[PDB]
Amino acid sequence: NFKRISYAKTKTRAEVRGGGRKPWPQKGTGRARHGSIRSPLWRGGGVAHGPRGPTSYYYMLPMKVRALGLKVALTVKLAQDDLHIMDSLELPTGDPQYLTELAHYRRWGDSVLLVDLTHEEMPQSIVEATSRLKTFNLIPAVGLNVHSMLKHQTLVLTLPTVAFLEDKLLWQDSRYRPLYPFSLPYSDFPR
Amino acid sequence: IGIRLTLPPPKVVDRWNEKRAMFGVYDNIGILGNFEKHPKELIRGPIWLRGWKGNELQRCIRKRKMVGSRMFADDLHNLNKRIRYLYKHFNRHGKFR
Amino acid sequence: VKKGFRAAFRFQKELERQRLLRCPPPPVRRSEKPNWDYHAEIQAFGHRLQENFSLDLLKTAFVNSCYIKSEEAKRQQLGI
């Protein structure tokens, strides 16, 4: 929801074409009294309480809360035997059928999320295999998130990725309250 | 009357298209990326709603300030009138004071 | 035209009820309908009546001459 922007919009009685004049006198005609043909009671009139977009849904959970969520997702996967640790993601070939057959033999479920340490250093073989698949998705460590972890039945992390995530997630537990954004220079950050 | 006599065409949704498969990736760009980028910078849309939220009166005030000078005459007129209506509604009308 | 699928499906079910009521289908044997196991039905028949029937005799009791003559005619027609 935080990056949702709804683009639905309707026209109020003030924005519908025309509708300026009073359609007929207040009294004497025997008809119901009306001020504008673009009233919400009229066919073709304005909308009383319709969408008024574009509308933003932005909000931010506390940084510590979002970090804790990543911990829980990793624990749930390990506790339910859906997490597998690899030394590297290098395949013998770039054929996607190999990776598909490997997952079936090892009982990895329908979909698998592959997490590498960095985008630039991803092995070419795994890049070629995953690029041609739909349920086998390769992401860098910085791209890990709860939604992708829950959408995918199996999670595969490389050993460097494991060290990467522990450093980032445990830093939240022992850190001071910020004095200014962490993007700015600190004594012991980054690393 | 008022109800269709045939079934509508079946809805085909590919749950593993590239857009759905990669939803959420980089939502922790800041936490896992040394805070070089804030997740709100991933939001795409109108220049006046990126990483910001408010009620309709606040949205209208924000849009007029940021892109009011670039709006079309008729659109800007409707915006000014909308702000006048909402100003009166929220500040004078309602159940609570 | 309104969005949605549930209302249309619900109405289709009723349109099929009315179609069937206007033109009731010809009755058929319960054996021809789904969920039928003759051997299981035979055993339950005796148990309902609290009677220790012999499954060999009970099955023969239900076989009629007309069913045998017709069963053979079908065999001859199929050259079996």
Add this chain to the structure above:
Amino acid sequence: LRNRVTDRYFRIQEVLKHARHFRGRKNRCYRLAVRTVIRAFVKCTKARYLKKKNMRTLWINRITAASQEHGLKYPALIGNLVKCQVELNRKVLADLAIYEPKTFKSLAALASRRRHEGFAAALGDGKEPEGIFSRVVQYH
């Protein structure tokens, strides 16, 4: 997102099914049927009180008719049967009058006998012992 009711047909039929046996336009026009269906259901609820009332009125009329055939008024039969520790209710008494005419005459005779015993007791000054049918069986 614009939402519109898509199953209004079924909502209407929920009311109209109860109005098929009505007269006039209120058997097919919702605006008319809905009001009349509500009234019918309220009547149905309140009728449960009248049903019990009318039934007991019917039994008393039938017991009264049966009692008069034997020269007894209804209060004499009901009053004296209670004094004989006969707890037959009026529903059973009405059924007995129709389908067991000999047993009912016996009950009328019993009530009549107990009634005459009451008169003898009231006329006496306590010298006479209790009537044979006037004795009450005590429980503990």
Add this chain to the structure above:
Amino acid sequence: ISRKWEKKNKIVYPPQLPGEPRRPAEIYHCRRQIKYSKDKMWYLAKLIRGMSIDQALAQLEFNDKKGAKIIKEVLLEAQDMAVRDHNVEFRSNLYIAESTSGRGQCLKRIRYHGRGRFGIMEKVYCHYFVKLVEGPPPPPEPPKTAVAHAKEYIQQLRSRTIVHTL
């Protein structure tokens, strides 16, 4: 619009068995978009229900209403069609099984009133439906006689039970 009445002359029944009774021929005919009122047409359709084809034609030939000529025109072409295309032996051996009028597609026009006011005038159209069945016209129902009432009254007395008891 609906045009189901014209599709009823296309129903092919299976061959009859030797012992079954001969099935009467049924002919459905209609005329669409007649410039005439269905309310006024109903009276003419009501007149000839149950009549023989020849009696209905005679009654309509001497009626002063405009619908009479149109219905007579429909009855004649239906009679010809029955013998020509529906294997009816005798053209006179036909009777009106059904005859009714229906509402057609109508047009709206303005009718002027005084004081600048107006009304909306409808240019009315109607349909006419007829069903011809082979055979003599069915006899009319004899008036319920006194013997029938007395028998019915005693029947209701005899079906009378003791209510609200055993």
Add this chain to the structure above:
Amino acid sequence: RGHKGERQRGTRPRLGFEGGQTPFYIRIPKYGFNEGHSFRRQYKPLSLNRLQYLIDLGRVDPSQPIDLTQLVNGRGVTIQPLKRDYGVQLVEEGADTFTAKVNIEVQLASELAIAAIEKNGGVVTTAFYDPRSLDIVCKPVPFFLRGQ
């Protein structure tokens, strides 16, 4: 919403209106309770208890001179120069249990607070920072990124 009146129609008067009677918040005489509030100097209190607690946990280093920067970097005090805070005032709360020897620079110091630090062999000085200087000394890195 109720039935009729101003309240069902949403047209009831503003907050504070009392029906025409001179409102409560108007019939009270004006008095200078808050006159000049935005030009009053404020000082964030720093007690000797808090100072000792920070030293015991290693969050403030007593082996080096302590000033506003070191207190802020240790998350001991939160200064808001934009809210007319002019620094920290050293308050005497906790003097009985103060044991650390420190060289500390504050803006205001009470008589008893000065005695506590000096009894233990420390030095205490009162130093003034203007609004601009206070912002820089409290958050040096954001200032260095301006290029001034």
Add this chain to the structure above:
Amino acid sequence: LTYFSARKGKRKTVKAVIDRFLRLHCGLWVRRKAGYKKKLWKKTPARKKRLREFVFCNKTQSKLLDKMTTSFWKRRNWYVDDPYQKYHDRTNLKV
């Protein structure tokens, strides 16, 4: 009261309140007595002393005054040598 300003879309303070009332951080409001400078020549000393008192407002008045002021006025302040510093916090208050 202005609930949403046209320029900033924010709630505004009624400055009439700031000119007459002092808010203690504990939530209490302090005011002066009406008429404490009016026709003193016809008022007795006991009455005049009562008029010079700084008195508290009740719950209903305090709730109204809180609604008529923004959060800025309810913050904790540390003015140097503030006369009302001691009264900002309550002591030995049960409920």
Add this chain to the structure above:
Amino acid sequence: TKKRFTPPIYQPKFKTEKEF
């Protein structure tokens, strides 16, 4: 009492001109 007159309103012509 001021004279009160309500002039007649003609509906759109097209609504009474449609043909088959």
Add this chain to the structure above:
Amino acid sequence: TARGTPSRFLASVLHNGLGRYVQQLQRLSFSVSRDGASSRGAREFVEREVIDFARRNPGVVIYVNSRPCCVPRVVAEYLNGAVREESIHCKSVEEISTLVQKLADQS
């Protein structure tokens, strides 16, 4: 209401209980989805309840059919020819047991 609905007199099937009592429920047909969430309670009923229920009622032939379905249903058929279709959509295992037992006792 009574006037808007049909009625009947109290009766039995073949004077049931006069010479001997014969259970009128003759057949039960379940349709439980393997994966449907609405059929969770129906799957739990087929694992522990249906087998013990059949032991007690040997005169009832129970047909469990596992197939994709959004609304699991049980169809009860009686000796007199009556057919009753009852939904068990999203019902708990205890609720299903009560329903099945009610069907067994009806005529």
Add this chain to the structure above:
RNA sequence: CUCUUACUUUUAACCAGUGAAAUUGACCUGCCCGUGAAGAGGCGGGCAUAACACAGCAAGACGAGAAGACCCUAUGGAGCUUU
């Protein structure tokens, strides 16, 4: 006018063609007395009572029409006059 009458035309009624409007909560739409938001076809007590057209009538349906113009009210308008 006492005190009205006769005839002709129009309208009218009947046949044929064409075909509006206001109105309409639903109606299986009696009379008397009583009652009641104080004047009852609809409530209480009585009396009356097979069903359905056509032509008249104007006592009732507080009949239709126009959110009373009289009157009062609104911190509602407007025209006019003025020390």
Add this chain to the structure above:
RNA sequence: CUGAACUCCUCACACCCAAUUGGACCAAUCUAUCACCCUAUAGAAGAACUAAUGUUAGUAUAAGUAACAUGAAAACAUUCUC
């Protein structure tokens, strides 16, 4: 003796006050993930109409009523009447 929704009796129990207020459920729709003869857990919102002399469209009622129209004969040439 008759006589209530009072009370008893067999069984069950949250299941008869306007404004207002608290709470428990829920139709359909869209989205996420499921499901796969029509569903589940959630997230959303132009999210529910027996009443506004409401708006638009359809069709009734009044009503086949009010109202409307063509001088005559003839060979359709013509003549006659006004």
Add this chain to the structure above:
RNA sequence: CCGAGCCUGGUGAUAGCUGGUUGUCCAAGAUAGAAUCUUAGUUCAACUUUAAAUUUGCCCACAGAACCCUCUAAAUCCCCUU
């Protein structure tokens, strides 16, 4: 429809005034007053609703609460026990 034309715009003018206000189910729920260009409305009390805290509430025994003046009133206040 000239006590001052008509059209468009400001304009979704304002209306303490009238009308209208859409799914199911349960629950609590009636009424001292004061001020007000105010009495067709409001704001504060009172009553009412929800949540929370901890401790008495109601019913009431004696003893007790005015002289002046005519009805020497029915009663009230206070109040342990229960």
Add this chain to the structure above:
RNA sequence: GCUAAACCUAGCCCCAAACCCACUCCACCUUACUACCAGACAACCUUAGCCAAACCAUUUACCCAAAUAAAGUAUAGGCGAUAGAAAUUGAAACCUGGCGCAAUAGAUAUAGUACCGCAAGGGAAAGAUGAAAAAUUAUAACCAAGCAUAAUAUAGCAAGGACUAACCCCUAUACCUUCUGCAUAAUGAAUUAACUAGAAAUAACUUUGCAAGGAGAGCCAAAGCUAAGACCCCCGAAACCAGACGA
């Protein structure tokens, strides 16, 4: 059985991106769309009022060139309603997307046309086969009100209790609104379909996170702080003002 019903496209909405701008020949400021004659006229100049202040008379927000923050602070004001800065601070920025509409919706739009008005101006309605119509004797039927098939039999808000039995018996003063109180002879409503009305701060509460700290510079803090959830309708005047159009 008729009248009808049903449909999924036409296009449209909100953003993003990108600055924008036409022309054959002939005619067109006089009575425009009119080949061809003596003229000389020339543009600029404070918005007002409704409304809020419960009247009203000073007053009453209206993009004006950077999101945030300073701050609803300084300050202004029948010091009332309300109005409201600056110094200083300092972020991001990859068009080809949609928890937008789908023929009463979405642009008024099939079109600024038909039609209405002297003029300014106002301003619609609607379509639906199939791969093939060079397959048109073709694509089923079923569903609103209204009718037809099929008028009616004592008695009464039209039902309920029932009953062997439709009615006869018994019980029963439509609904909404408005009121001290309505069967009221008080309001609205022929009927069907569709459309048609509760928007949000201040605090508080509930459930997470972290905790003398909380928060992804600003702010708050004597258990607080951060995040989320959850409350505030629709139609209707006579008027007022500005600029046009009309003898």
